[PDB]
Amino acid sequence: EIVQLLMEHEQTDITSRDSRGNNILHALVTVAEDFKTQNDFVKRMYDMILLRSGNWELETTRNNDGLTPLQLAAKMGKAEILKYILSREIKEKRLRSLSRKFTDWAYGPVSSSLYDLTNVDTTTDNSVLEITVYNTN
Amino acid sequence: EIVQLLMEHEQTDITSRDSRGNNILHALVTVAEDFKTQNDFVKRMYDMILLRSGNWELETTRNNDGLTPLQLAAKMGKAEILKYILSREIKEKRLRSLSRKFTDWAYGPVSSSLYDLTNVDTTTDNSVLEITVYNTNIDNRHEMLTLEPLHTLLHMKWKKFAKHMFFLSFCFYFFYNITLTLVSYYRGWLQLLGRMFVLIWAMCISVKEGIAIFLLSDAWFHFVFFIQAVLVILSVFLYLFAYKEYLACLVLAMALGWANMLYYTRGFQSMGMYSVMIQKVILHDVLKFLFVYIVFLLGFGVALASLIEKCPKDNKDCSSYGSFSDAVLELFKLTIGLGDLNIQQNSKYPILFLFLLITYVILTFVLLLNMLIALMGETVENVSKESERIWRLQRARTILEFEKMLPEWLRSRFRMGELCKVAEDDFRLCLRINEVKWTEWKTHVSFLNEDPG
Amino acid sequence: LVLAMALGWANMLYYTRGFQSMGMYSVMIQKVILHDVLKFLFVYIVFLLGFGVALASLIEKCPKDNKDCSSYGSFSDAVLELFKLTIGLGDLNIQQNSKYPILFLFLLITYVILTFVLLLNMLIALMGETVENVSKES
């Protein structure tokens, strides 16, 4: 409730970056732990905030360590938030451009979905796939 | 209902002590059993009565055995009532002074609670921590030392002193045993330098382990170290005196010492659980094997000696089996693969002989030796769960021993815990434990400091 | 040269990770060496070093210029002879030049018992315990 109050407030700045460089999504990633602990309310808040401000601005930024909240979830050990972020299906046709997974065609039970490799597929400098493999911590 | 009737009655005396010395709380402790049995209605009644009469009068008294209901729950095996008593959070601000656990500060999920060490932390005569460790009449002590203040008392003591005293002891014993080996192996000034220290530290081990063995399967090491020291100093006496038997006791003491390196594997988690599992395998499995095996050695020994009993005709190589000793020794060779299996002259019954030997090989190898491996495979599965707790218990007893060996001032130097003000007049030594809980959210009302630190 | 060769054939193992059936196998080996075998080798070497100086001091009497009379020379020959005995090569007999043949024999039999019927089978049980947990994550 308080989150919706603050975002609905016209003066709130959703994209604000704290002293560490983290915006709100980085913060939600550095927190979230596991299902046996938090019962997964962080994924819900992450979705809520993204859908509430339509943009790639939040998820494309970088904290002072030079990481997007996706790459940050890769550096840290957070699987439950990474599955969510890494496959998103947004059903509402307005905000559907924010999804990372799409259904190319579906007929009966058979369906061919489609995934987005931008920061994943290791055509970039440090991607999600290089981190999850070479990260020994 | 009837309890509330009696307490609400003005004439009832809540603090009455029966002929055994027990007040009502002692009585509730001597009763309560477990959750699978009573479904835990005793904890509820204990809470009800305390909250109904505000005081420390009840829980501070002593029955005729000189025990508070807390210490009594420690003597007896009662864990479920001890967790309750040992951490109490009373939310009502009036009676909050009776709690043994407090929240120093809480912000969001993070909260730092605070525990009360008064009769726990072993600054008293017989405390909750000394009892749950040294009390051998229970065998519930696994779940006893996993409770909230006790776990971190042991941990903090280890991180403060008991680690360094344990390692230091390992060094002083290790040098001792090396010098003992170098003395044993070479038999000018080396004997004068080392041998004196051998006698000295051996005498120290003998006296200390002897005093500890006068206060009596947990203490089994105290017998072994003592036996070693006796053998060492005895060998010294027989070396000063003129005798040939000194070397036997010397080398036996040495080998026994290297068998006593094992005691120091309880300082490490990975090796500690290992030596625990060995200690249980020897008890539950191997002994049964050695008994039923020795009965066969003794059977087939007299079985074969009587057949090979014919006269060697002054040829020791013709008859391979002499009296009962040579037969048993030859069978034990055969288990290793040294023994000589052939049709034997001087044995008038070579077929029966050979059959009766083959039955030995079969009963030993393909049956009774593999049975042991299967059984060990059965015990490892059950012990793998409790081994960590068992090792925590042993480590705990070592910790308390090192604590009891310190001087009064150096002991008071550490003094785990801190003074904290719980109430207006209440200052009590407390132990801080930080916690993070995401499961249940609430507005924090009862707490100690407003500013989280 | 030969040490490098043998090490190379020990390095064939690295290429078993291209196949599923052998890859999981070499993983389970890699974990067994770490969790189980090392604990065995430590507690076993401490016994070799114990009984070596135990027996050498008893057989320490002069061979009388006969190398076959005294089977145990310095600490090396004793350890080597024990390791023979584990394989079944070692020569077990009442030994001349050992002034204490009963104590000697007892102290050797205790070695055989502590090794085989106890500490070597313990390893097999523990490995049987680790294979059950590793079989899932391998």
| DSSP string for A53-103 | S-SSHHHH---TT---HHHHHHHTT--HHHHHHHS----STTTGGG-SEEE
> What interhelical angle do C121-137 and C20-32 show, nearest 10?
130
Structure determined by: cryo-EM
Q: Does C24 touch chain B (CB under 8 A)?
A: no
- What is the least distance, in Å, from the CA of A35 to any CA of chain B? 10
Closest CA to C47 of C103, C102, C116: C116
What amino acid occupies position B386?
E
Determine the residue type at B366.
V
* HEC secondary structure over B276-312: HHHHHHHHHHHHHHHHHHHHHHHHHHHHHHHHCCCCC
C-alpha–C-alpha distance, residues C48 and B24, integer Å: 62
Residue A34, chain B, CB below 8 Å: the answer is no
Q: Does B248 touch chain C if contact means CB atoms closer than 8 Å?
A: yes
Q: Which residue of B has its CA nearest to C42?
A: B271
Task: Confirm or deny that B301 is annotated as ligand binding.
Answer: no
Asked if A7 contacts A52 with a C-beta cutoff of 8 angstroms, the reply is yes
Are B212 and B224 in contact by the 8 Å Cβ rule? The answer is no
Neighbours of C68 (CB within 10 A): 7
* Cα–Cα distances in angstroms (integers) from residue B210 to residues A17, B134, B204, B230, in the given order: 69, 18, 10, 10
b/e sequence B418-445, b meaning 16+ C-beta within 10 Å: eebebeeeeebbbbebeeeebeeeeeee
Give the C-alpha distances (Å, rounded to integers) separating C18 from B17, B84, C15, C25: 77, 56, 6, 12
B185 contacts in chain C (CB < 8 Å): 53, 56-57, 60, 75
CA distances in angstroms from B148 to A68, B30, B217, B419, C20, listed in the order given = 40, 22, 28, 19, 46
| Cα gap B328→B302, rounded to integer Å | 9
Look up tokens 């055994």; give the residue: B20
Q: What is the 3-state secondary structure (H, E, C) of chain B?
A: CHHHHHHHCCCCCCCCCCCCCCCHHHHHHHHCCCHHHHCCCHHHHHHHHHHHCCCCHHHHCCCCCCCCHHHHHHHCCCCHHHHHHHCCCCCCCCCHHHCCEEEEEEECCEEEEEEECCCCCCCCCCCHHHHHHHCCCCCCHHHHCCCHHHHHHHHHHHHHHHHHHHHHHHHHHHHHHHHHHHHHHCCCHHHHHHHHHHHHHHHHHHHHHHHHCCCCCCCHHHHHHHHHHHHHHHHHHHHHCCCCCHHHHHHHHHHHHHHHHHHHHHHCHHHHHHHHHHHHHHHHHHHHHHHHHHHHHHHHHHHHHHHCCCCCCCCCCCCCCCCHHHHHHHHHHHHHCCCCCCCCCCCCCHHHHHHHHHHHHHHHHHHHHHHHHHHHHHHHHHHHHHHHHHHHHHHHHHHHHHHHCCCHHHHHHHCCCEEEECCCCCEEEEEEEEEECCCCCCCCCCCCCCCCC
For the purposes of burial, counting CB atoms within 10 Å of the CB of C121, is it exposed (0-12), middle (13-18) or buried (19 or more)? buried
Which helix (H) or strand (E) segment holds residue C3: the answer is: helix C2-11
User: Strand A101-107 vs strand A110-115: parallel, antiparallel, or unpaired?
Assistant: antiparallel
Q: Which of B184, B337, B372 is nearest residue C88 as measured by Cβ atoms?
A: B337
Burial grade of B21 (CB within 10 A; 0-12, 13-18, 19 or more): middle
**Which residues partner with B404 through β-bridges?**
none
**In A66-79, which positions are buried (b, 16+ CB within 10 angstroms) versus exposed (e)?**
ebbbbbbbbbbebe
Distance from C-alpha of C138 to C-alpha of C135, rounded to nearest angstrom: 6
Are A131 and A75 in contact, with CB atoms under 8 Å apart?
yes
Tokens of B385: 């769960």
Distance CA B345, CA B341 (A): 12
**DSSP letter at A114?**
E
Quick check: helix, strand or coil at residue C128? helix
Which of B197, B211, B205 has the alpha carbon at shortest distance from B231?
B205
- The span from the CA of A38 to the CA of A45, in Å, is 12
* C9 CA: distance to closest CA in chain B (Å): 32
Tell me, what amino acid is at C26? Answer: S
CA distance B58 to B24: 8
Cα distances (Å, whole numbers) of residue C46 to A73, B379, C119: 47, 26, 12
Alpha carbons B237 and C58: distance in angstroms, whole number: 19
